[PDB]
Design a protein around this nucleic acid. Structure first.
Lengths: 156, 98, 63, 124
RNA sequence: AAGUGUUUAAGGGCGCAUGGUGGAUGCCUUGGCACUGGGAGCCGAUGAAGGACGUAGGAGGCUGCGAUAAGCCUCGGGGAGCUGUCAACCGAGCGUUGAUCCGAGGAUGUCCGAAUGGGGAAACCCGGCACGAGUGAUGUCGUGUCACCAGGCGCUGAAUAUAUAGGCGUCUGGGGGGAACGCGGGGAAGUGAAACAUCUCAGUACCCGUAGGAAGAGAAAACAAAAUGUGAUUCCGUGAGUAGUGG
RNA sequence: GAGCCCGGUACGUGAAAACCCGACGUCUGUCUUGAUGGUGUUCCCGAGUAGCAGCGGGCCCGUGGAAUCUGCUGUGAAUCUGCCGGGACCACCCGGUAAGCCUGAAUACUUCCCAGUGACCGAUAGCGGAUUAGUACCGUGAGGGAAUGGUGAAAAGUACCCCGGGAGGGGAGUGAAAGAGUACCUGAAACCGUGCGCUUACAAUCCGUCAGAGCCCUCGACGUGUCGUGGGGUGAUGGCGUGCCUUUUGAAGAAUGAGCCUGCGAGUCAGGGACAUGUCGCGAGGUUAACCCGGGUGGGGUAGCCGCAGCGAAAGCGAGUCUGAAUAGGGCGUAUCCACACAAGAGUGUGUGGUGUAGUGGUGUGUUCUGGACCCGAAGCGGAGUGAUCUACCCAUGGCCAGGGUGAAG
RNA sequence: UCAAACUCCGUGAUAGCUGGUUCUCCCCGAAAUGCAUUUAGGUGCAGCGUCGCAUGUUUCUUGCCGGAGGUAGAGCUACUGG
RNA sequence: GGGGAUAAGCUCCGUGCGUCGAGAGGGAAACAGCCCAGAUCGCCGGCUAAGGCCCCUAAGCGUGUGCUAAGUGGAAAAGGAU
RNA sequence: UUGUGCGCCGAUAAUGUAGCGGGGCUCAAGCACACCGCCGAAGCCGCGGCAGCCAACGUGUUGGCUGGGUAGGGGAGCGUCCUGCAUCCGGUGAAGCCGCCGAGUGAUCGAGUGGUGGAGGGUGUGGGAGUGAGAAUGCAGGCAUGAGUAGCGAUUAGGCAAGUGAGAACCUUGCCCGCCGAAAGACCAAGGGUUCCUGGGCCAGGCCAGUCCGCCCAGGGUGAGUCGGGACCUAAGGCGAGGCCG
RNA sequence: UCAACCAUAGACUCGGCGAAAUUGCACUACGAGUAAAGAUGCUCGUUACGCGCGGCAGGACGAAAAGACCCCGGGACCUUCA
RNA sequence: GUGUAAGUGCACAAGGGAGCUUGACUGCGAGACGGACAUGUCGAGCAGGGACGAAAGUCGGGACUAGUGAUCCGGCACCUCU
């Protein structure tokens, strides 16, 4: 009611008019007036404990591994030149599912570019693994170095 | 607010005394905790107690005599109670203080 | 904003080991001539806060 | 998410307005007046469902009284005699007999007269 | 003879079928709102911000521009249509010898505005000087320049003597605008205390003076507590709603 | 409803000129007439300053025992065995060297430009402003301040004929559609008509509800009209029946409010806030804050915080502690239970064994604190400005007062 | 427009006061009392509702038993008053 | 029970008193507070409560024994009255 | 005389019988005492459905009690929108709207249907709300009632003939009549701003109509040595180089 | 006293244009009752064909002004040995 | 008659007289009454050190119930506190 333009002056006669008493032209009951309990900018992030996050990730990955949806590859394509056909064929050999999660190192630029354009593929770094991306994927294809990096980070 | 009657937080006297800003406080640990946490005995310093989670990390430590001490244990703390000293020396251990 | 506790309540009320709220009794500042020593003895020390005032005093102390 | 109220309100407005077809004046056109009249109508219907059983029993008793006095007997003595004789026909079917089968009603009157005591005013 | 007996709609009510009005709903959008990451953080007497008046072949508004007036020049890009738009209707024309269009640098830039030759009711009145143009001459026209104050330099030195104030000339600055942020000063009341004056509100609102791209602070006449301790300033988290303080 | 049609996207490439960042130079300053570690004494180390006093300001500190800092007014020192500080003050120790000046980074902000984003709005919303928008309009002025979006894929925007002065319409065409005709998507309600069915001019009606004749329509079955497990419209007639909301002991109303419809209009958010209660993780432990590194929602980060011992004003002691001369009772504390004893029947206690103690961090919900805090509503109070073109008085300079009487001084 | 003009701002001033507060169903279900109050139309605590937990009939009714009264009635040279 | 003029549809207290408030249904002509009775919903079944049974209006111009002449019934005192 | 059951005067206000609810009743339908029936509620019973609490046995049945309700407490749900994920429908016609026929204990529902329409919807399971209006002398828009009603703005007054024209009480021309005439005539100042003239127009405006107009459109129109101002002068008053004060 | 007549402007009729205050409704009688006392709407009765036009003002506690009288709270201004 | 209102008591005296005396104490206090809370009230008994009494014993003011003022702020005395 106080941020809308104008409306600083009491409009008219309180008495004698026979009309309702109004203190501003920007009161909420007026057309063009302010909003009473409206949206304001806010932050929705929550302070979830670390153990809860790590345990949820472990549970998702263990669910994937129970149904042998975990795959390891040396490399997605023959190196130094991205190729979506080769990566698509390799992924087809690995799995016939729809959505896959590809976990490769941050330096594996050729593989990331090779699988970038595939509609069902989501590419993540081993240290960025999270519950949402794992649970969104039918299969999780790991890179050997990425898998070893994840094991080294956790099991150590 | 209490309706104009003199409120409960104003018709009672303030608690007597002062606070002694210079007060020295000790984190306390009983010999029963030592018995339960050091089954083999040995040297028991301040940061062994911190490692075992018997006291906070960066605090003065005083040993008390609540429990039963049946292990030969050498303790180095800031202060001891009388019964604590008798318990530690009774089991053949030593009670040196910083 | 963090809650601000009441100053007077903080000066007038205490908590024991098991969380009991403890206060001091009134009528013991001045005019102690005509008061018999038994009256001033029954007014000495501290008692626990009555059940009616427990909620209000707890509210005044915590915040 | 800003939500417009139109659909949710129109639902109940249509329900109430459809229920108020046939009313006179504002009570069938405007939703507020129709809603007031609907409150009154459902209260009336609830009361009248309870009262209808008594109304029909009163009508049956009137018809049975007429047909009984046509047979030279009063309704109360006839009911007492029918109860004494053990016949268990209720007032609805008694009135049905009175209107549709007068001979059967006369026969029932005869059995009721037979079942009555000899001196109805005796301290029995 | 006695008795029974339908049938009227001036208009009204309800239902249905068909319309009108109106602009809800649903689906949208050349518009907004809140943010993120960069850039730039000043413009102005070489006349600003912002305007008035004009300006296209044709009336007006928005846009651009300034008597060189939807524009001039140079250097780049681009490449076939183009003469801004409401907004067309014509009428005339340009373009492969490169147009229209986009970027950078120049030129022109009426009048008002700090506005500054003088005046003034902003956008309109009247001039001095110098040099040019024009006229038989006066009239007229063009281009420069002419405010005040401050600080340098040079000349002079009142009453009056030393001298100075002042005066004269010449150079260099200033003036005003701007959303937030800075620093230094001045400084409310509604309100709360269920009254109210101490107190709160609040050093807030507001005002004054000043900046900078940031500012302010900053290199111990500091803390500390017997530790053979830290070592300029600033900012962030704790310490902590604590120690305290308070009709 | 397009990866393969277009603009584009990934990815590459490009600057004559101007400007901005670097770099190497000319250029400038500067040290080399220089440097070291040693010995005992005089001089210097920022003056109207420090300090003190009076009156103020501000510090957690509201004048208080009031230190440190600071303004005005008085008074007014010392140069190192000097001075200042360590919360009145003094002595001793410790720290530092006032009354001179510069200083980058870490931090605050967005008029403006560029590139993006949204479990943001979608035309009464979102900026006041999607349309002539700070416009029209209102006000002397400071100032206040609107309303107005959608044909169609393409204008193909209805040639021609007819009624009519036109407007408008009917044919005819365009169009997939004219139930798309520049009054144009969809086209609700209030409101206003036209046609058909039933009803209504002897009747006292919160306008409905329950029975209900008659008439009309419709679905099934059998004949020709006549019932049925029927259904709908209208309803003569009979019974019953005191509008909604609010405020109230109590209102159908003669207490309050509402002409109607459609839109809009009121318990929300923030905070490691407080209490309680669900739920999840870990568990005698739980947890990070700022910050750092990741194009994310991920990883790190132990500083802190809460539990882990209490009692006492405190020194302090500690499963005890305080009071007290007291083992002499009481108060508070030793999770809780169980067993065994010894005491007491002034209410049960005192011990010995076992049993072993639960917190904390997310998040849901209900209350609560500080914030406008569920929404709406004064008369008034402050600060800064605008008004004497109305009106009050004054200042300067102009104008006007037909005609007829009366008859002062001189 | 005047017992202190108008405009904007503080500002969404403050009202123990007035008005308003939007879907449903199921279970339970009050109070208009006491004390205090710059208090009386407000509020604090208690009384009465509901929900959860703990405890079990401790609540209630009737019979019997053990208790204290100074009312109704009555009485009065048993007192005090008329 | 107090106050008031034991006047108020006056006011203030007590009451394991009631009802209304927050309670529909039946009765009292109508009638928050009186009488009967506490509505989960349906039925074109039955029995009753309060109150009723000539007609309105469901059920008795019921039976037996007496009274009333006043329409008493169907409002009222001191008092008066072959 | 005594007590008694019924009776009589006392008795008596102003709209209308009005002090049985009405008609009416003593041939009681009045009163008292006995007796016999029946009516009468959402009370109780009968038959069927639902729900809460508890019990029994079971792996959801049965049974017993209970189910008015304001303030208020607790529990479980309907509908709206936006969204993660997963599925399904849609120019062979989504949403929205208007009907029909049905459905659920309620909010409500209809992947049942017909018409209209023209591009997006449904379902499941989670997440978040600008999530539900009937009322604040609430706000905006549209439209009723009063109602085809009041009024149509002075104190002068219009008439006729002819014309124009689709259309004339109001426009044009003529002839009359009336009104002002220290004005209702003529000319300036302030103010206004193109209203002036010519030609054209007749949806808006004009309190009716209008062919007319101060309305709308286009074009045209204002000529100064001497008139009113400046370039001449000052008043009140304003601003004010330096300056004084703050 | 004690009023009568005349003329104009309305009022009234016709043609044209065309508002407003008000409004929970509506096929809005009377008497005696009853009721929050003040009844078109409740009870019992009585009266009354439907729709208009011109009029009068008894009622709708008619409309208007969140009274113009009393109280409570909040203001404002004024006074003084607060 | 009981210091003092009224009431409940007191003749066993709590009413009158005399002798000694300071318990008109210190540390406490099982258990209770009354109570929204804050207040308020009674209290046996234990220890120290006393008074009176041969002793038993009684004495923590007065026959009892009024003679009073929370918190804050400040003053004074003492303390093995800071």
């Amino acid at each position: 009611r106080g941020e809308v333009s104008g409306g600083g002056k009491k409009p008219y006669r309180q008495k004698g008019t026979g009309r309702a008493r109004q203190g501003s032209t920007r009161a909420p009951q007026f057309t063009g007036g302010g909003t009473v309990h409206g949206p304001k900018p806010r932050d929705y992030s929550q302070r979830t404990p670390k153990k809860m996050i790590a345990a949820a990730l472990r549970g998702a990955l263990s669910d994937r591994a129970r149904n042998d949806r975990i795959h390891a590859v040396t490399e997605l394509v023959e190196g130094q030149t991205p190729s979506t056909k080769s990566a698509k064929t390799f992924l087809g050999t690995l799995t016939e599912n729809k959505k896959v999660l590809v976990v490769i190192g941050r330096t594996d630029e050729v593989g990331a570019k090779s699988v970038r354009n595939l509609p069902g593929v989501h590419v993540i770094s081993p240290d960025q693994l999270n519950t949402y991306d794992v649970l969104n994927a039918d299969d999780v294809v790991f890179s050997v170095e990425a898998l070893n990096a994840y094991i080294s980070a956790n099991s150590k | 607010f209490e309706g104009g009657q003199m409120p409960i937080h104003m018709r009672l006297p303030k608690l007597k005394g002062f606070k002694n800003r210079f007060r020295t406080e000790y984190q306390v640990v009983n010999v029963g905790d030592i018995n339960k946490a050091f089954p083999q005995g040995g040297t028991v310093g301040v940061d062994e107690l911190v490692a075992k989670g018997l006291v906070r990390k960066n605090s003065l430590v005083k040993v008390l005599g609540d429990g039963k001490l049946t292990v030969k244990v050498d303790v180095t703390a800031n202060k001891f109670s009388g019964s604590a000293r008798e318990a530690i020396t009774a089991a053949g251990g030593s009670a040196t203080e910083l | 904003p963090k809650a601000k506790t009441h100053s007077g309540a903080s000066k007038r009320f205490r908590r024991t080991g098991t969380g009991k709220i403890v206060r001091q009794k009134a009528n013991r500042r001045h005019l102690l001539e005509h008061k018999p020593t038994k009256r001033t003895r029954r007014l000495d020390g501290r008692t626990t806060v009555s059940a009616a005032d427990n909620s209000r005093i707890n509210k005044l102390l915590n915040g | 998410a800003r939500v417009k109220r139109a659909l949710n309100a129109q639902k109940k407005r249509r329900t109430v307005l459809k229920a108020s077809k046939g009313y006179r004046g504002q009570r069938s056109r405007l939703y507020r007046k129709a809603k007031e009249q609907q409150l009154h109508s459902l209260t009336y219907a609830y009361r009248d469902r309870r009262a209808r059983k008594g109304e029909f029993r009163k009508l049956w008793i009137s018809r049975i009284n007429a047909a009984a006095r046509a047979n030279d007997i009063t309704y109360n003595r006839l009911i007492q005699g029918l109860k004494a004789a053990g016949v268990e026909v209720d007032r609805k079917n008694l009135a049905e007999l009175a209107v549709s089968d007068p001979a059967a009603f006369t026969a029932l009157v005869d059995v009721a007269r037979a079942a009555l005591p000899e001196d109805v005013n005796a301290p029995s």
